[model samples]
Target chain A: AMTKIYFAGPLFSQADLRYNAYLVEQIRQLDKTIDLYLPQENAAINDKSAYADSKMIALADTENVLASDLLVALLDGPTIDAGVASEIGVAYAKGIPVVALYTDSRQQGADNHQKLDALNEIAENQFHYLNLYTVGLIKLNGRVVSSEEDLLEEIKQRL
Target chain B: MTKIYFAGPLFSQADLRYNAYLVEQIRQLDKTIDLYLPQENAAINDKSAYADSKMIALADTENVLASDLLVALLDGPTIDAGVASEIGVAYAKGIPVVALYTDSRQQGADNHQKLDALNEIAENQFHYLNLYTVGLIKLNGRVVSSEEDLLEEIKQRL
Candidate 1:
């Protein structure tokens, strides 16, 4: 009932901000008492128009990360968002579980022989090369789910 | 001699050769710094072999945390995801990070046409890097625009 969670993802774009709010609200409904630290909502250091320099942003975000009991990170986009990946590292180092959401549809169809064979050809691969290094960080202590529903299910099991 | 973790993308032929070239130059420095270039540690990074994600992450992260500094190559289309992850781990552990980001779009800071192009759709004249990752380095490190500056920065720190 007293769990502390950190929501880690890209928050610079309108899409990012909207999606973050949507997911954070979903997590909040999971446990009414959980203290969710959504970085975008932390106006003190995250005010986009204001001048809270890089060090301020890094340290402030790191503080919330170290304090969180669990972290739910979005691993979507062309690359895993850099700050999100960093938060995952911090949470892993501090022994907090990270629930990563990777909803890229291209990851489907792993059983197709032709599709699998195409990976060997240059620029012909169908799936995104999810960076194994950052992904491994989650696999070691937490979990990676392909959809938001799966993500919520995993968190429900953990919480 | 200080131990430096040279972190960057090494999956492509271009990546491999560039990393090798830079590592060679860094090794030839007068200060005699010890370095760990990921590609050199083929046990985990071998292209033909299989080292699972966990192994790769643990091996690179352990070396980063153990090092005196992390020298990252931030010259790709975006920060290489692994290098960005390494930068984060380095920043959190109080390990310094020095990056090489020599994107050519940065040369026209005073050009009015380049500045004016910011208003045009898909016409901006600069390399758009992930600022959050750049912030991580700027907080605990610095980014140099050229190979010479990168060498000088590392040499000064050494």
Candidate 2:
């Protein structure tokens, strides 16, 4: 059976939108059976009022989330996108599987890494830039992968 | 009466104090709104209980599930991970969310304004907030720049 994946990520910028398209294409190519709900492609904005348009898009995307069997979120920024985080939260509460692709390499914790490193290895023990809870939610049902290859592999196994 | 789960960074003393201050401020505005300040309520004060991460997670999840709404602090260089997770949980449970972000850095665009003016621009543009988080909160609730604004919105909702 084909698995429905809700693709969540940041798409405010042209670069982000392009990346989303590229990523979705790559995922689809990997497995033709997988169905993806790409919000950028799926959300319709016909309403004239900005508020109404926004509500329409949210409702549409949320409907997809509710329908999806799994969620694959791009957690690439310094912090996860708020909308993506919320989607993860919603999917998580419903016991839907969530897989987060976090490729950002930014270090987290203390300002002075050198000082902390000199004192002890405690600095390495600190949680990285990604939120513990966000990571936890993904781990609850799925996993967080740092690379596209790994992400594809996880999807293949789960789906 | 309404229950609000307070979510934000608590890795520093200043952060903890700020959380307390915010909770007190909300309580002062309306005594009926129940505020769940996780840092204070998640048994972080209990040295023995604090050692168990599972216990803390369970406690936080339970609080979020019990709460009617969520107010997330979205300040700092980046969104706090734990708070983001709590936001996810509350949001998933169909709870309303209000994000409070006070950072002055504009997103994408560069600015040469004075520091104070930049702060105002940040508040006005709301570019400091991550787009997805902002969109998610707006799905059910709103984003406020000041305590006054937050109080007004909460009161209106309640």
Candidate 3:
């Protein structure tokens, strides 16, 4: 059976656009049966009116999310992209499975290097970049993977 | 009356207290706005429900869907993952999202001092915080630094 995946991530800058495209291509190559909806390409945001364009783009993306069977979110950077997080929330509410891909090697949680100095200043504390709730949502019907190979395996298993 | 869903970290005492303080501050500005604080309202008292993570999550998700707007706390070294997800839900629904990112520390590839320094390409090209999160908030509402500013902005928007 072919699985419909909504690819959600940051697609603002040129690099982001290129990366989103590359990711979509890679996923398609990994599994020919999988159907992907890349918002950057699917959403039409070229209208003369900026407001109209935004509305159109948002509407298109929302429709795609509603129509898709699952979501593959890119959870990279110091934190997850706000848009991607929101999309995950939508998927969660709709009971759609989400497979989050986090490749950043930085250590998260209590001993996170970024929060070490700040933690030293304060009393004993446990800090983590990965939000437990977001992780929980991913675990609800899907899984979070750190590597492409792992993601591929998960995708294959899910399909 | 506008219902604002408060989304942020609640894993620790500090986080819980901060969430309480922020909610109180907003209430002080206007008594009419219905502010939903998940930490205070979501299955915290029910022992059986507390043991069930899905129940707790469902409760929060319901609030996010029902709320007209969302006030997300994006402070700390990195944005909380749960809060980010809540914000995403709000965004997807076309609800307004107001992000509170007061942390002065910059998170990027290059070493910079300015609070609003734009980082390089390899580092996601964001000013200081996460680009997509900030961008997503800006898509609907705006980001504020101080409690006073946030209150004022909410007042104006509402």
Candidate 4:
């Protein structure tokens, strides 16, 4: 009940929105009493049907980020989502721990021969590389996990 | 000498080319200043070369802290994620930031049709910067609309 969490991730696409909802609920189910802030849920500043200037949205979301005790960010995609990355930066600067979820299938099968061999060839990289600086920000203060299972486990430790 | 750290996206051919061009122009403007381009750091920027995330993170963060100023290229689909994070580091460390945002969608703002498009669903077109990141830069620096203006700002700072 004393812990506050800020869920930071992409919220534009159907996949992103659903994914954020699904994972955030999982964290909630961990403890129904904990406080959570999800960006998409802030319709006052985020409603696409209406209008809120960039500065308005920034102030509102950032205020939540500053208020939170922990931040969990999704780090899977072609590139790190700029908004999510920015939130991670703000959290990092404020000394808030961030738990990043990077669930890319390519990360598995590390011992497989072809997968390891793929790293030797051009354009055959078998691993996904999120932006190092952003990932480092999380690593400095918290952790990076690859699945829902591990993510929940990490959050449990914090909670 | 004033040290400037240039931050932006440099993942593709177009990005790589433009970064080089703009950085070179800045370089030509002042010989006494020291400028760092992450792309030039092969140990970390080289995709072909092996470097751990921690190495890249520490190397860049060290430079960002050491520098007196940061010039971020705020172009692309949005402010590049890495650049945003870099701007955060700069802001936290009190290094002044200058953002270069040149999106042409913002040019024809006075056109009535374009203004009307704002009312239609999926018809409105305007470049969007992640205001959170823009705010960090603005609090610690300024955003410019042109390459000339960026160069001028850098000149003025020095």
Q: Output per-candidate TM-scores for chain A, rounded to 2 decimals.
A: 0.91, 0.81, 0.79, 0.90
**Per-residue lDDT over B1-158 for candidate 4, one digit per residue giving the tens place of the 0 to 100 score:** 88889888878999899999999999998988899888887555465776566666777788888889999998887677789888877766678999999999767687889889888888877777877788777776899999999999999999
| Top candidate (lDDT) | 1
By TM-score rank, best first, the candidates go 1, 4, 2, 3
Q: For all the predictions, what are the DockQ values?
A: 0.60, 0.32, 0.25, 0.55
In model 3 chain B, the worst 10-residue window by lDDT is: B113-122
Kindly indicate the candidate among 2 and 4 with the higher lDDT: 4
How far off is residue B130 in model 1, in Å?
Answer: 2.2
Docking class of 3: acceptable
Q: What TM-score do all the candidates reach, one by one?
A: 0.89, 0.72, 0.63, 0.86
Tens-place lDDT per residue, model 3, B43-116, is 44553644344545666678888988889888866667677777766776788988787765433436453323
Off by over 4 Å in 3: A1-30, A35-69, A74-84, A93-96, A101-130, A139-154, A157-159, B42-53, B105-127
- Model 2, residue B103: C-alpha shift (Å): 5.8
Model 4 clash pairs are: none
State in Å the error of residue B118, model 1: 3.4
Between candidates 1 and 4, name the one with more favorable DockQ: 1
Over B1-158, each residue of candidate 1 has an lDDT whose tens digit, in order, gives 79999999988899999999998899898556999887886765366888788887888778888899899998877778778777877876788999998889768888999888887888887887776677778887899999999989989997
The segments of candidate 2 whose C-alpha lies over 4 angstroms from its true place after superposition are: A12-19, A42-54, A104-128, B12-14, B29-33, B42-57, B76-85, B98-132, B152-158
Residue pairs with colliding backbones in model 3 are: A82-B133, A86-B88, A86-B89
Give the proportion of true interface contacts each model preserves, from 0 to 1: 0.61, 0.35, 0.36, 0.51
* lDDT per residue (tens digit) for residues A1-159 in model 3: 788989988887787788788777878887788999887775556665644433444455667887988799888766677567767877876778999888776545545665666665756444435655676667777788888788777877877
Q: Let me know the DockQ for model 1.
A: 0.60
Worst 10 residues of 4 chain A by lDDT: A46-55
